[PDB]
Scaffold this active site. Structure first.
Site, PDB file in Angstrom:
ATOM      1  N   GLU A   1     -31.852  54.817  76.092  1.00 42.37           N
ATOM      2  CA  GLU A   1     -32.853  53.857  76.571  1.00 42.37           C
ATOM      3  C   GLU A   1     -34.186  54.557  76.754  1.00 42.37           C
ATOM      4  OE1 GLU A   1     -32.717  50.724  76.601  1.00 42.37           O
ATOM      5  OE2 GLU A   1     -30.569  50.149  76.636  1.00 42.37           O
TER       6      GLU A   1
ATOM      7  N   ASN B   1     -41.455  44.461  74.711  1.00 43.58           N
ATOM      8  CA  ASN B   1     -40.469  43.736  73.944  1.00 43.58           C
ATOM      9  C   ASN B   1     -41.167  42.630  73.158  1.00 43.58           C
ATOM     10  OD1 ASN B   1     -38.653  44.019  77.004  1.00 43.58           O
ATOM     11  ND2 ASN B   1     -38.348  45.216  75.151  1.00 43.58           N
TER      12      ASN B   1
ATOM     13  N   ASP C   1     -40.453  39.600  73.140  1.00 40.73           N
ATOM     14  CA  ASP C   1     -40.603  38.389  73.912  1.00 40.73           C
ATOM     15  C   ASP C   1     -41.793  38.450  74.859  1.00 40.73           C
ATOM     16  OD1 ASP C   1     -39.643  39.904  76.013  1.00 40.73           O
ATOM     17  OD2 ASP C   1     -37.885  38.706  76.398  1.00 40.73           O
TER      18      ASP C   1
ATOM     19  N   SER D   1     -42.019  40.518  77.489  1.00 35.08           N
ATOM     20  CA  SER D   1     -41.587  41.333  78.614  1.00 35.08           C
ATOM     21  C   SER D   1     -41.781  42.815  78.260  1.00 35.08           C
ATOM     22  CB  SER D   1     -40.165  41.034  78.986  1.00 35.08           C
ATOM     23  OG  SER D   1     -39.270  41.426  78.015  1.00 35.08           O
TER      24      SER D   1
ATOM     25  N   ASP E   1     -39.807  46.756  79.184  1.00 32.84           N
ATOM     26  CA  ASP E   1     -38.721  47.512  79.797  1.00 32.84           C
ATOM     27  C   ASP E   1     -39.296  48.766  80.452  1.00 32.84           C
ATOM     28  OD1 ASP E   1     -36.809  45.789  78.716  1.00 32.84           O
ATOM     29  OD2 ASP E   1     -36.049  47.168  77.258  1.00 32.84           O
TER      30      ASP E   1
ATOM     31  N   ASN F   1     -35.871  45.266  82.721  1.00 25.69           N
ATOM     32  CA  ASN F   1     -36.684  44.272  82.052  1.00 25.69           C
ATOM     33  C   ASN F   1     -37.509  43.456  83.048  1.00 25.69           C
ATOM     34  OD1 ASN F   1     -36.941  41.358  80.510  1.00 25.69           O
ATOM     35  ND2 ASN F   1     -37.247  43.091  79.163  1.00 25.69           N
TER      36      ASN F   1
ATOM     37  N   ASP G   1     -23.947  41.347  86.681  1.00 24.94           N
ATOM     38  CA  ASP G   1     -24.438  40.002  86.385  1.00 24.94           C
ATOM     39  C   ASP G   1     -23.524  39.215  85.444  1.00 24.94           C
ATOM     40  OD1 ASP G   1     -26.433  37.826  86.336  1.00 24.94           O
ATOM     41  OD2 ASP G   1     -27.083  38.638  84.419  1.00 24.94           O
TER      42      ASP G   1
HETATM   43 RU   LIG Z   1     -26.712  35.768  85.681  1.00 18.53          RU
END
Ligand SMILES: [Ru+3]
Ligand SMILES: [Cl-]
Ligand code: NA
Length: 129
Positions: free
Chosen positions: A35, A46, A48, A50, A52, A59, A101
């Site tokens: 990473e 990114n 999109d 966003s 990182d 993110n 998550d």
């Molecule tokens: Ru979730």
């Protein structure tokens, strides 16, 4: 801060990532390697819109606030700059929420594509932990 491999392993272990949600320490070290190259200051925009941030490339769409990511959340309740500190506490605490998550370490694309299914124990070889 660019961490050494075993330096980072010890810090991650120190903060309770070894075996967190069943993921061995070598998984976390491998993820950080691919990473961020073990660099706490790493940032990557990114597609999109966003970004990182930090050692585990967390993110700004979901996890931290950077002020420039529309429609995003801040579920770790932190400015994304906190994730760039030489102190990995904030990154670790946030990573514990991410990995809890639902999709586990698949949330880290470099882990899925480069660590998952590999000999991740190699990443802690030689470390006194
Ligand atoms: Ru979730
Ligand atoms: Cl999982
Ligand atoms: Na955000």
């Amino acid at each position: 801060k660019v961490f050494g491999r075993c330096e980072l392993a010890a810090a991650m272990k120190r903060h309770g990532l070894d075996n967190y949600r069943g993921y061995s320490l070598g998984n976390w070290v491998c993820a950080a390697k691919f990473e961020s190259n073990f660099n706490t200051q790493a940032t990557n925009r990114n597609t999109d819109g966003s970004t990182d941030y930090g050692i585990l490339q967390i993110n700004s769409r979901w996890w931290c606030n950077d002020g420039r990511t529309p429609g995003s959340r801040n579920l770790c309740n932190i400015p994304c700059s906190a994730l760039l500190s030489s102190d990995i506490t904030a990154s670790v605490n946030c990573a514990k929420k991410i990995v809890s998550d639902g999709n586990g370490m698949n949330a880290w694309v470099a882990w899925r594509n480069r660590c998952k299914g590999t000999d991740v124990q190699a990443w802690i070889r030689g470390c006194r932990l």
